[PDB]
Amino acid sequence: TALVCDNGSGLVKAGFAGDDAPRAVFPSIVGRPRHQGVMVGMGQKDSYVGDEAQSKRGILTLKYPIEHGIITNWDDMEKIWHHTFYNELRVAPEEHPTLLTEAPLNPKANREKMTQIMFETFNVPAMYVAIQAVLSLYASGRTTGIVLDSGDGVTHNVPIYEGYALPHAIMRLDLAGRDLTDYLMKILTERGYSFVTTAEREIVRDIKEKLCYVALDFENEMATAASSSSLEKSYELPDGQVITIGNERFRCPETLFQPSFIGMESAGIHETTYNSIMKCDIDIRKDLYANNVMSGGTTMYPGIADRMQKEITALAPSTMKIKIIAPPERKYSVWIGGSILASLSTFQQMWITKQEYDEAGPSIV
Amino acid sequence: AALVVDNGSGMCKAGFAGDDAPRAVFPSIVGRPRHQGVMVGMGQKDSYVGDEAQSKRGILTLKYPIEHGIVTNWDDMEKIWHHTFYNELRVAPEEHPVLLTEAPLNPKANREKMTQIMFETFNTPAMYVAIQAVLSLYASGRTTGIVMDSGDGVTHTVPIYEGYALPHAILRLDLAGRDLTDYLMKILTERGYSFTTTAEREIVRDIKEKLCYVALDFEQEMATAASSSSLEKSYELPDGQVITIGNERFRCPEALFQPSFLGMESCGIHETTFNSIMKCDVDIRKDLYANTVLSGGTTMYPGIADRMQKEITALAPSTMKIKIIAPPERKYSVWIGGSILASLSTFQQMWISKQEYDESGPSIV
Amino acid sequence: AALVVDNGSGMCKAGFAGDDAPRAVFPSIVGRPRHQGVMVGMGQKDSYVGDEAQSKRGILTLKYPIEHGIVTNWDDMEKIWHHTFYNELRVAPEEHPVLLTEAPLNPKANREKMTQIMFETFNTPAMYVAIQAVLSLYASGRTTGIVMDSGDGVTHTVPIYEGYALPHAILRLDLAGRDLTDYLMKILTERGYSFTTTAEREIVRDIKEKLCYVALDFEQEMATAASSSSLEKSYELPDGQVITIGNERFRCPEALFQPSFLGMESCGIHETTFNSIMKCDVDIRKDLYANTVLSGGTTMYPGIADRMQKEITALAPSTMKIKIIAPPERKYSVWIGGSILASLSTFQQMWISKQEYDESGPSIV
């Protein structure tokens, strides 16, 4: 049984081929001690990764290595690719062909850095790297179509004709889950609660996952929010201090459609979907909109699919009937797309072997 | 069973002698695979053709081999027939004698060239090259008459005497399909509904069929359209605007009768008819005016017949019955007429066989 | 003196008739005030626009009013002209007639809507609108010919007959300024150059202009680069180490002729031009070939002229004298051709007068 790993900014997803649900599923944090120290039971470690890092947080500084769908630093990444295959997956990489994910339109050196490292350090008999959005479209049973794959780092749009992405029209919008968490922090503060730490960044991303809803309309909602507490959700902080959340519960996910609110001059998601298809062929536009597909983290919200239809349904070319598929299991989609493909009795001529590396080197990726 | 292959200018039809609808229908396109630049490896098959080539497009050079009925280029046209046999009907031409379509106003040297290729390269047992309109009258169960084809870019009026065309009078006029569709694009430019070619030109064509018709009288229909609301038809999008087209619907067919609308020099389509008839035999003339028959895609406008019968009555001697025979299936009349023809046992006493090619060569048809 | 307003998709150009070079040249941007929160208010100037908006940026939702020579919004755009008048040229258009320039097959309703805004909102005495390319053929000193424009967003190949564009041949191909540079970034990164998303996209653009060209033959330029370091050019960053880029400099512009590098389903800058010309009149063609002009910024890669003369000679029949004119100033050519037409009084007895909008209304364009 071979390995599949959808890494992200915030979330790694990993395991074996053909397993329905993933084995390793963990926050890409590496974490440094704020003092030298060893206490009881276990000798001192240099960094803490994943879940280890998430519990150690207060006595750490936390550092993420993947930003915006790109792996910035590799040192940190190895500490994570250790925490998979050894800690979470509980095997030895030696027996096991591995698949890692990649960003729609990742630079070449980066990709071949994955291929260098996994063949040297983790020494796997075979590796594959595979493009996130496409693997989602696969898990969703389709050949052609357009994906919105959004996580803590990035939202992409990747138009696909017949199992192939059209690179020229990929939108990579740098507004996503991190931008939506620190904003939710900022606006809960702009209700009237004092948020302080990067741990309280978890408190907000929790409210973000549980209480939020992509405003089905923006203006109709603000009117009812002003008129009635009816929209408010109570929230027990780990303190016991029951707070409130009301108009912000839509003001936060809304930033996907309007970058105006925070910072950028750019188009909101509805415009980038439509816009990427303007950069695409007319014949296929129809098969692209017919099958919009969603994955990642920052797709997971209430209202967002319903919204994603209506908002565009005002913009596309004259025949192009739309339908926004956000598979309910969507976070794991890429990995389901990976796992099954990686189990395919065909796919054994699609892996890169360790031998292929020792003959030809990293640029084979 | 023998073949009928109706290579309409952009769209080849095929099948067998004795069917009621064409058994292989496809775009007569040859795709030449390409990216220039000295690509190190291209792919399989030097030319694609047909519905394959339609999907394959962006990687092929797509062009119709045919122009107006005429083989422009014999090489990529040969690939059209090569497709018909060993791809479309999955047949073997050495077993299967083929009726071959030829346009109104199409002599001599391609017949002469056609009989070469088909008897040497594709070793057909026998063949007959046959005028598109001359079979179109056969589908309508007739033999004397005048048939009017208008397909994509061609009108055609062919004075048929007894299943024989009188070639000098066969008119071809530069008015059909596109010249009405790009003109209909220019009709939706006063208001106007954006399509241009980015590339909703197809949707313009799509309006043409579903929502346009013929004014029996232009003037009373103008004032009646100015009386609004019943003539206006919504061309809604499953998306944006519920666009409304009114004046359009009768405006665009009218360029057939008044070449004022498009700038082009023409007598009316009614006078095209007259200028086949009066150029020929007189003892057949109300047998022409009473076997005046229609063929092709641009004939199918709902109201042309009532308009035609009238508009020829404005011209012809009083003492002639104008009787506009338009068949129900006038899109495929040529293939049907060919099916009937190659269901005559007497088509054996009629086509040219292998024998007569190996003796006479090219000029035999 | 009357006006000429070259609203190139991200950069407008304005001024008068008679002037050599553009008199107001600016980022076609109109920024709305923003911030969200909900607070006291804002107050002054509901849209800061032009370079005022370009300095502002991170305080205003700036947006791009055009994309692919298609106007994306009219409200923002109206304020581009209003800026042009009462800020840029400091003029009032009720005195000053305007000339405007659009895309080759700028969508129908965009042309008209444009004029409405100019005739009732900005009440011009007169206006001549036309296609950006037609003017650029007049800048090129021609009347008949074909223009292959490549700005930032899309190509256009416009068969102009005697100062008139023919829309049925005019093709538009999504290969331009962005698409070159986004590749060039992905191709610097093999050496780990990695400017990614700092700010240095404009530096990958600075490389593009200052150091790139088009290989004459490709495979022999490959071996020539592989004999090293006269083809490489070193590069000091605004702040940063001297880099060296070699193989790049032709590899990226080749990719106008080659879509496989970008990974796209497209024809090459040479062939789309061929397929544009063939759709034009058999006769006019001789001097469409013999007067291919290049215009727009993304043609500017050195070597393209000798390259493209050869490249069309790979595709066109030998009986026509191929001769690619490319002007040294192929950014300003559309305002130059603009100013040529605007300095010609025959077009005074020919442009859209206010009175003709009082007669015909929106339809007049």
Which 3-state string (H, E, C) describes chain C?
CCEEECCECCEEEECECCCCCCCEEEECCEEEECCCCCCCCCCCCCCEECHHHHHHCCCEEEECCEECCEECCCHHHHHHHHHHHHHHHCCCCCCCCEEEEECCCCCHHHHHHHHHHHHHHCCCCEEEEEEHHHHHHHHCCCCCEEEEEECCCCEEEEEEECCEECCCCCECCCCCHHHHHHHHHHHHHHHCCCCCCCCCHHHHHHHHHHHCCCCCCCHHHHHHHCCCCCCCEEECCCCCCCEEECCHHHHHHHCCCCCCCCCCCCCCHHHHHHHHHHCCCCCCCHHHHCCEEEECHHHCCCCHHHHHHHHHHCCCCCCCCCCCECCCCCCCHHHHHHHHHHCCCCCCCCCEEHHHHHHHHHHHC
With an 8 Å Cβ cutoff, is C41 touching chain A?
no
Distances (CA, A) of C221 to B90, C213, C233: 46, 12, 15
Candidates B69, B278, B68, B267; CA nearest to B159 is B278
Distances (CA, A) of A175 to A165, A201, A311, C267, C322: 22, 17, 18, 34, 49
With an 8 Å Cβ cutoff, is B190 touching chain C?
yes
In angstroms, rounded to a whole number, what is the distance separating the alpha carbons of residues A115 and A102?
Answer: 12
- Residue linked to tokens 């292998």: B354
Beta-carbon contacts of residue A19 (< 8 Å; ≥ 6 apart): A339
Contact A16, A1 (CB under 8 A): yes
Q: What are phi and psi of A204, to 5 degrees?
A: -65, -45
Q: Closest residue of C to A262, CA-based?
A: C35
Candidates C130, C65, C79; CA nearest to C101 is C130
Per-position b or e across A197-228, b if 16+ CB within 10 A of its CB? eeebbebbbebbeebbbbbeeeeebeeebeee
With an 8 Å Cβ cutoff, is A168 touching chain C?
yes
Q: Chains near A, with 3+ CB pairs < 8 A?
A: B, C
Q: Checking DSSP bridges between strand A242-245 and strand C292-295, what pairing results, if any?
A: unpaired
Q: What are phi and psi of B76, to 5 degrees?
A: -70, -30
With an 8 Å Cβ cutoff, is B51 touching chain A?
no
With an 8 Å Cβ cutoff, is B203 touching chain A?
yes
Q: Which of C108, C155, C365 to mutate to test the interface with B (most CBs of B within 10 A)?
A: C108
Candidates B216, B226, B260; CA nearest to B246 is B226
Candidates C100, C90, C89; CA nearest to C124 is C100
- Min CA distance, A314 vs chain B (Å)? 4
In angstroms, rounded to a whole number, what is the distance separating the alpha carbons of residues C116 and C354?
Answer: 10
Rounded to a whole number of angstroms, the distance between the first and last alpha carbons of chain C is 22
Do the chains contact at C186 and A105, CB–CB below 8 Å? Answer: yes
Hey, what are B213's tokens? Answer: 């018709």
> Which residues of chain C neighbour B61 with C-beta distances below 8 Å?
267, 271, 275
> What are the strands of the beta sheet with A48-49, ordered from one edge?
A48-49, A30-33, A60-63
Q: How many other C-beta atoms can be found within 10 angstroms of the C-beta atom of residue A196?
A: 9
- Min CA distance, B200 vs chain A (Å)? 7
- Beta bridge partners of residue B293, listed in sequence order: B147, B325
In angstroms, rounded to a whole number, what is the distance separating the alpha carbons of residues A185 and A193?
Answer: 9
Resolution in angstroms for this experimental structure? 9.5
Hey, what are C190's tokens? Answer: 């093999």
- Beta bridge partners of residue C63, listed in sequence order: C30
In angstroms, rounded to a whole number, what is the distance separating the alpha carbons of residues A175 and A155?
Answer: 7
Beta-carbon contacts of residue B240 (< 8 Å; ≥ 6 apart): A313, A314, A315, A316, A318
Method used experimentally: cryo-EM
Do the chains contact at A319 and B206, CB–CB below 8 Å? Answer: yes
Q: Could you tell me the sign of the dihedral formed by the alpha carbons of C51, C57, C63, C69, in that order?
A: positive
Classify B120 as helix, strand or coil.
helix
Candidates B254, B270, B287, B63; CA nearest to B155 is B270
Q: Closest residue of B to A316, CA-based?
A: B239
Hey, what are C88's tokens? Answer: 């840029």
In angstroms, rounded to a whole number, what is the distance separating the alpha carbons of residues C348 and C135?
Answer: 16
Element (H, E) at B226: helix B218-226
With an 8 Å Cβ cutoff, is B241 touching chain C?
no
Peptide bond preceding A321 in cis form (omega within 30 of 0): no
In angstroms, rounded to a whole number, what is the distance separating the alpha carbons of residues A276 and A305?
Answer: 18
In angstroms, rounded to a whole number, what is the distance separating the alpha carbons of residues C204 and C250?
Answer: 15
Q: Chains near C, with 3+ CB pairs < 8 A?
A: A, B
With an 8 Å Cβ cutoff, is A260 touching chain C?
yes
